[PDB]
Amino acid sequence: RKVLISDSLDPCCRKILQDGGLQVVEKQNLSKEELIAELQDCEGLIVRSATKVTADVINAAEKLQVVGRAGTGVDNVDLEAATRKGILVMNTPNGNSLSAAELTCGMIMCLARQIPQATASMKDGKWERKKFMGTELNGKTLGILGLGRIGREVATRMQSFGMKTIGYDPIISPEVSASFGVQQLPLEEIWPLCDFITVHTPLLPSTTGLLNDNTFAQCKKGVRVVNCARGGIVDEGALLRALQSGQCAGAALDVFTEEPPRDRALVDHENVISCPHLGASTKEAQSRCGEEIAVQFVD
Amino acid sequence: RKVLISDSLDPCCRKILQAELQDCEGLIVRSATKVTADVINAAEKLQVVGRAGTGVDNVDLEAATRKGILVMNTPNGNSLSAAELTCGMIMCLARQIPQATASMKDGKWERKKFMGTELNGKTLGILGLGRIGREVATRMQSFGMKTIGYDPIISPEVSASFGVQQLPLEEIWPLCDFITVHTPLLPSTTGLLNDNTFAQCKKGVRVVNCARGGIVDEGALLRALQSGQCAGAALDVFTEEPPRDRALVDHENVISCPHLGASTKEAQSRCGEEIAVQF
Numbered sequence A: 001r002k003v004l005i006s007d008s009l010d011p012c013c014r015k016i017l018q019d020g021g022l023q024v025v026e027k028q029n030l031s032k033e034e035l036i037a038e039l040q041d042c043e044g045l046i047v048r049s050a051t052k053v054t055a056d057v058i059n060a061a062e063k064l065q066v067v068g069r070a071g072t073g074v075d076n077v078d079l080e081a082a083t084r085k086g087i088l089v090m091n092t093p094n095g096n097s098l099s100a101a102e103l104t105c106g107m108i109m110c111l112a113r114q115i116p117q118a119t120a121s122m123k124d125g126k127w128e129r130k131k132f133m134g135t136e137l138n139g140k141t142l143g144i145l146g147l148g149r150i151g152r153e154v155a156t157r158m159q160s161f162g163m164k165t166i167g168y169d170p171i172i173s174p175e176v177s178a179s180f181g182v183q184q185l186p187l188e189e190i191w192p193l194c195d196f197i198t199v200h201t202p203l204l205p206s207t208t209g210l211l212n213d214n215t216f217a218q219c220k221k222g223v224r225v226v227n228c229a230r231g232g233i234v235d236e237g238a239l240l241r242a243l244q245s246g247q248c249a250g251a252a253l254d255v256f257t258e259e260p261p262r263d264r265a266l267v268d269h270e271n272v273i274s275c276p277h278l279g280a281s282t283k284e285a286q287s288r289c290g291e292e293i294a295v296q297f298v299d
Numbered sequence B: 001r002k003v004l005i006s007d008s009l010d011p012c013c014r015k016i017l018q019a020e021l022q023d024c025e026g027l028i029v030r031s032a033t034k035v036t037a038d039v040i041n042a043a044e045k046l047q048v049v050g051r052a053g054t055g056v057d058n059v060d061l062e063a064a065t066r067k068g069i070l071v072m073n074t075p076n077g078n079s080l081s082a083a084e085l086t087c088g089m090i091m092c093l094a095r096q097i098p099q100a101t102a103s104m105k106d107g108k109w110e111r112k113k114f115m116g117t118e119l120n121g122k123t124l125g126i127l128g129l130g131r132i133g134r135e136v137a138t139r140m141q142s143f144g145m146k147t148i149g150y151d152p153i154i155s156p157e158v159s160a161s162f163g164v165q166q167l168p169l170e171e172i173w174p175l176c177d178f179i180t181v182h183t184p185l186l187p188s189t190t191g192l193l194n195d196n197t198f199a200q201c202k203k204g205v206r207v208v209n210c211a212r213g214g215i216v217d218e219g220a221l222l223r224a225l226q227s228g229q230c231a232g233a234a235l236d237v238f239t240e241e242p243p244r245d246r247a248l249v250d251h252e253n254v255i256s257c258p259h260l261g262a263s264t265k266e267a268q269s270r271c272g273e274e275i276a277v278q279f
């Protein structure tokens, strides 16, 4: 009957919740005391990733019935604690897929042509044409690991650049991926073929360190790698070693095993381009997720 | 019988053929070397000047013609690389990747600052629908951008075949979320984007120039950026190269490269081979 919105959400979320007949209260960046106190009269909580929904937070809100996440995953929500109290947890798995796919494509282009580094050079007063000789994407092979919502959207865009798109996904059949132009091969056959590799899987035991010292050793010398999925899918130590040896020519990272990352070695590397987890950070994605979660609450 | 190579060319160019111009019948350049009237006249034996690239703006065509010197180029050799950089600038403007990288490298984690724009459903205006313009169009169409444009010699039927609706310029400006230019530099295209045309644009338009410096009036661009009329610009090219005025490059909403549009191993290989073969 009453819902708190604790993070930075599009105005449409509050609006929809009230059309359904609910009261709202949208205080951002609250403290553990100033949140749980504002959770006392609310049956619903809505967050992005800023508000941390620990067991201690969940247990304190006696009236809490539902936690809604405006995004994919449940990383900032204790799914175990919630279930132990009969609290429903909902998210918005489709709301920001396009924005993540678009950012991934931008990362690929930035790696091919070193645009972030070139801008940095220009702003440092330099004119360094030879240093930034880049790579044409036409005819190059892009490997896509994870062919769900985002992987297939990345594929069709990079196909317009004349990239060959190959990939792997344990639940997508070769016939199905072919229908959006991705040729599936066993992982072992993928590494030596790729000029670029991008990952679009959840973080699981099978995907933690999907790229590691061993798979980097099976890659083309000079492969470039993108992670706009979850930190840890690409083993960060292995990536660094590959960058340092030159086996990896560059990497683009939107996500990290720790956010913000305390370890600065990858971010500081001259061949690494990075963003502070911006994959879902468009006005449009935020509008869509804001609505998607409100709709789920109204029901 | 003898050929000089004066700029930075792929190794294949010298191999294939098999001041310091006094004994040469052939000269090969990119855009760095200025082949002015004064230069052509000194080289009595010069028969052909080959440009490993698209423009011949750096070659005095009048001087060459007055001495019977053939001037050749490689008009298709680096078109793809230019179109690919243009698309990358477009993505960079929408999501501010270069700025976010700079931020991260300063130890910052600035999520709110770099809230961006989704390309899907946005309108891209493409001025110049020749070799590069049409390649930018089909790529950005895969992102779900509406592509409109203008070109005085390209028919509506031809642009329709690569999905670009042509309109008069005056109708283009208010429609565009992004504008990219792919024309030569001519009096008619100098300041194609200027104060008068920025005034007709959507507030917050984003602009790309990977063509020639001056097509976007740099003084006008800075004013549009200062007001917010232009939300961002990506520049590969400048009216002076390297530019001595740093105001645009130094602007936080400006992304830039030192004229890298043709600077891929593949483009240079193609232009290098193509011009050598012609010799």
Ligand SMILES: NC(=O)C1=CN([C@@H]2O[C@H](COP(=O)(O)OP(=O)(O)OC[C@H]3O[C@@H](n4cnc5c(N)ncnc54)[C@H](O)[C@@H]3O)[C@@H](O)[C@H]2O)C=CC1
Pocket (backbone or CB within 6 Å): A072, A073, A093, A096, A097, A100, A145, A146, A147, A148, A149, A150, A151, A168, A169, A170, A171, A172, A200, A201, A202, A203, A204, A206, A207, A210, A228, A229, A230, A254, A255, A277, A278, A279, A280, A281
């Ligand atoms: N950087 C950001 O801001 C954003 C990150 N994401 C994340 O991107 C990733 C992909 O998201 P979606 O495509 O919507 O998820 P999805 O669930 O639609 O697709 C994920 C695919 O990964 C497959 N997969 C699982 N294990 C695999 C393995 N060992 N190898 C290859 N594929 C495997 C799954 O079968 C599934 O098809 C997720 O981690 C998501 O949380 C999503 C949106 C924004």
Ligand SMILES: NC(=O)C1=CN([C@@H]2O[C@H](COP(=O)(O)OP(=O)(O)OC[C@H]3O[C@@H](n4cnc5c(N)ncnc54)[C@H](O)[C@@H]3O)[C@@H](O)[C@H]2O)C=CC1
Pocket (backbone or CB within 6 Å): B054, B055, B075, B078, B079, B082, B127, B128, B129, B130, B131, B132, B133, B150, B151, B152, B153, B154, B182, B183, B184, B185, B186, B188, B189, B192, B210, B211, B212, B236, B237, B259, B260, B261, B262, B263
């Ligand atoms: N940034 C870089 O390193 C590179 C820059 N370029 C430059 O890109 C530009 C386009 O190259 P291409 O597409 O291969 O040339 P193109 O000759 O194939 O097409 C140029 C088009 O611009 C049209 N045009 C002329 N005036 C116009 C006007 N007022 N408004 C609209 N259209 C007009 C022409 O009708 C022509 O169709 C040239 O300036 C070229 O020198 C080319 C390759 C890489």
